[PDB]
Design a protein around this ligand. Structure first.
Ligand code: Q8O
Ligand code: Q8O
Lengths: 304, 304
């Protein structure tokens, strides 16, 4: 028993982190096979970030200008190319620690682990979610760019995020490993404001099921609702609309606990309208939305 | 910017996890050098746990009864001994992945990362604190015993916890790596109730400093207090008494932010008396106490 905000074990990803320096800029790179992936803004100075022309800045860089270091040993760069907002640096040595991997582009509401790194060295690991406005709320200082987000399925690492930007509001933006930004964000230091950060309803419901499984049941009530009625309340509270697809995804948790999805929606509706009244659920005083239904099943069943 | 509940990168610890089976019981072991450490209750059945005589149960076990498996390869057990509540299984092969390590016994209020494992396989990593009542609030299912807690200082892993028990209330109890339980708990399935789970005041203050550094400042007020006055309010709210040692420990955060420790105590006192009023601090609706002052400095400076 007990339910924690849990990240995936980071070892497989630690074995892929390298330091990339170009000019005066140092950030992190991800070394998979004989390619090192990193944000293309490694070629910029802070002044260039105001209005960068990446193709033009890149023409002035040669393979020998990209310094790639794995631990205390230097990697030889034999090619470089720009793919969307990432650079792919071809090196002469395959990473011997390359795990089985995939590149996946996640949807908003999906969770992943981030291995925060500086100078190609891991500092920590935390769990987060792709917000509905395509930002993430991470912990990233100068030099953390190129740190990655991932999920693991037994022995295959699915990389889904690479850190690029901190918006003027302190939230974060980045790309998938094909270099396409999540949402409308760009790798330029300009006015980029995020949209409404709505709450991921399906994740809140999954977490309420985790609370019932792990003993916290005070919020269960004598009511039910419909998807349409629940969604009127969800709209009012800046929650994402709940769909029949989300109800189907919650089916296994509903079956395990014997609490119908719409009855849990009615508990959630009352929590939204009445508040917590100074009470807590799984050690939280707010409705937690950074656990997917899959995360709840995985943690409650101990998948390794 | 941004502040997250961050665990240490777990790779160095993943390389030490093994599966230990004795009879019908399987749990995790920690393989460092040529010794595998695991809870001595691996020798018990669930029925034995009601009233175990560990010395007597152990007499019936030989080296060949402890099955130790690292990945898919078996380790040969050439000796076994009981040290307090842990078994030390001497194996014929040193763990080639043994990191630099120490065994440390932490104090209440200190934080650490846990690598939750099942069948010697890592499932996830999370950050937690040793509560003032010597319990931890983890996420542990059947088979997670032997999972460990640790801190890392550059390349040296300090192991501080090994999971043993879940109390009837759903909180967790365990030992240091010398096999001594934290607090009054025992490895017997009996009535063991935890004391008051007070809030770690010094950690709440550190987290309020992290909030100011990372932009959340609404709770700062025009007041100050004294240690004695603050402690009267701390007593009322089941917070640990704040000492001059804690004030000294918060000195670097006070210097960085320019907010005197006693002024932050006055902000905390008002938060205790008035509540949050539906507001949040670093994404939390409660006062977070599982970040030490050292954690706040480490995360805010990007130590790798
Ligand atoms: C500063 C920071 C902190 C956390 N996360 C991201 C960042 N960086 C940015 O937002 C853009 C940036 C800023 C200066 C750069 N110089 C070369 N490349 C650069 C990219
Ligand atoms: C069940 C559990 C879940 C999470 N954390 C710990 C536990 N186990 C216990 O509290 C004691 C126990 C219970 C049966 C045992 N059989 C052999 N050894 C045993 C030890």
């Amino acid at each position: 028993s007990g339910f924690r905000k849990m990240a995936f074990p980071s070892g497989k990803v630690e074995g892929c982190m390298v330091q990339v320096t170009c000019g005066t800029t140092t950030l992190n790179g991800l070394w998979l096979d004989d390619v090192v992936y990193c944000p293309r803004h490694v070629i910029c100075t802070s002044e260039d970030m105001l209005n960068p022309n990446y193709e033009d800045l890149l023409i002035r860089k040669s393979n020998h200008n990209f310094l790639v270091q794995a631990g205390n040993v230097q990697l030889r760069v034999i090619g470089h190319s720009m793919q969307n907002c990432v650079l792919k640096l071809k090196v002469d040595t395959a990473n011997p620690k390359t795990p089985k991997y995939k590149f996946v582009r996640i949807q908003p509401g999906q969770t992943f682990s981030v291995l925060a790194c500086y100078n190609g060295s891991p500092s920590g690991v935390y769990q987060c979610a792709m917000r509905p406005n395509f930002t993430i709320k991470g912990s990233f200082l100068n030099g953390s760019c190129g740190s990655v987000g991932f999920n693991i399925d037994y022995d295959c690492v699915s990389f889904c995020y690479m850190h690029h930007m901190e918006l003027p509001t302190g939230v974060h933006a980045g790309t998938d490993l094909e270099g396409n930004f999540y949402g409308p964000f760009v790798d330029r230091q300009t006015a980029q404001a995020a949209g409404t950060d709505t709450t991921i309803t399906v994740n809140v419901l999954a977490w309420l099921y985790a609370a019932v499984i792990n003993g916290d049941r005070w919020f269960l009530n004598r009511f039910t609702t419909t998807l349409n009625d629940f969604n009127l309340v969800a709209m009012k509270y800046n929650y994402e609309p709940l769909t029949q697809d989300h109800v189907d995804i919650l089916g296994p948790l509903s079956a395990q606990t014997g609490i119908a999805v719409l009855d849990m929606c009615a508990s959630l509706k009352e929590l939204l309208q009445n508040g917590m009244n100074g009470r807590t659920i799984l050690g939280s005083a707010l409705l937690e939305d950074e656990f997917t239904p899959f995360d709840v099943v995985r943690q409650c069943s101990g998948v390794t």
